[PDB]
Inverse folding.
């Protein structure tokens, strides 16, 4: 990334805002993050699309629960060779806590971690 | 001594058996609610108390239902949010691992987190 060069997906302000929102656990800062990401000039194909429905809006409290949605995400594979054992372990613990799935990637796995703490 | 209480309850039950046999029935179910088997007698013609126990001897007719409880189990109640939680926190009861859940609460949801 340089000032004179092209534009990139991950700039400094975006990273800092995301890390702040995730460290303090404040949803308003994540909304600031999303506003700052979804307002740049079109950089990908999915920026030229527009969502336009015709039904009437509904209250938010009637939408399917959070956990039923969080169980639809995962973390892709990242081998223990590339990542540190610390980060691999933290990912595997954080994903097993919300009910979702994590990944092991290539490079096997430590057998001693086949049991809970 | 517990034997004393057991003997007391045994004698009390045998007396009821004797009385039921003397009347002509074979079960306490056949006698529950049958008010017509009770009559009022006065103490005599020297006390002159006008007590009329008929208000308690009145026999309302039940209809097509019986005169006692004819159902098993408790009266069930509608299911609260906790049911859904029990559907989700299964690794906690099967393995014993930390979990973390998020939902939406509404004022029409009572006893949030009691069945768990």
């Amino acid at each position: 990334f340089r000032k004179s060069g092209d534009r990139h997906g991950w700039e400094g302000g975006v990273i800092h805002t995301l890390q702040q929102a995730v460290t303090n656990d404040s949803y308003t800062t994540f909304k600031k993050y999303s506003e700052q990401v979804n307002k740049r000039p079109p950089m990908q194909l999915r920026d030229l699309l527009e969502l336009r429905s015709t039904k009437a809006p509904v209250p938010v409290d009637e939408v399917e629960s959070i956990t039923a949605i969080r169980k639809r995400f995962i973390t892709p594979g990242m081998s223990m060779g590339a990542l540190s054992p610390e980060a691999h372990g933290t990912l595997n613990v954080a994903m097993n806590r919300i009910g979702a799935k994590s990944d092991s990637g290539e490079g096997g796995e430590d057998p001693a971690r086949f049991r809970p703490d | 001594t517990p034997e004393k209480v057991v003997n007391l309850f045994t004698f009390l039950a045998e007396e009821v058996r004797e009385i039921l046999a003397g009347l002509g029935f074979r079960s306490l179910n056949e006698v529950i609610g049958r008010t017509d088997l009770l009559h009022q007698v006065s103490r005599g013609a020297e006390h002159l108390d006008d007590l009329d126990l008929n208000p308690r001897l009145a026999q309302v007719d039940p209809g097509e239902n019986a005169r006692y409880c004819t159902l098993q189990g408790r009266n069930e109640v509608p299911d609260t949010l906790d049911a859904r939680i029990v559907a989700d926190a299964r690794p906690l009861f099967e393995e014993g691992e930390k979990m973390q859940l998020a939902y939406n609460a509404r004022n029409t949801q009572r006893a949030i987190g009691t069945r768990l």
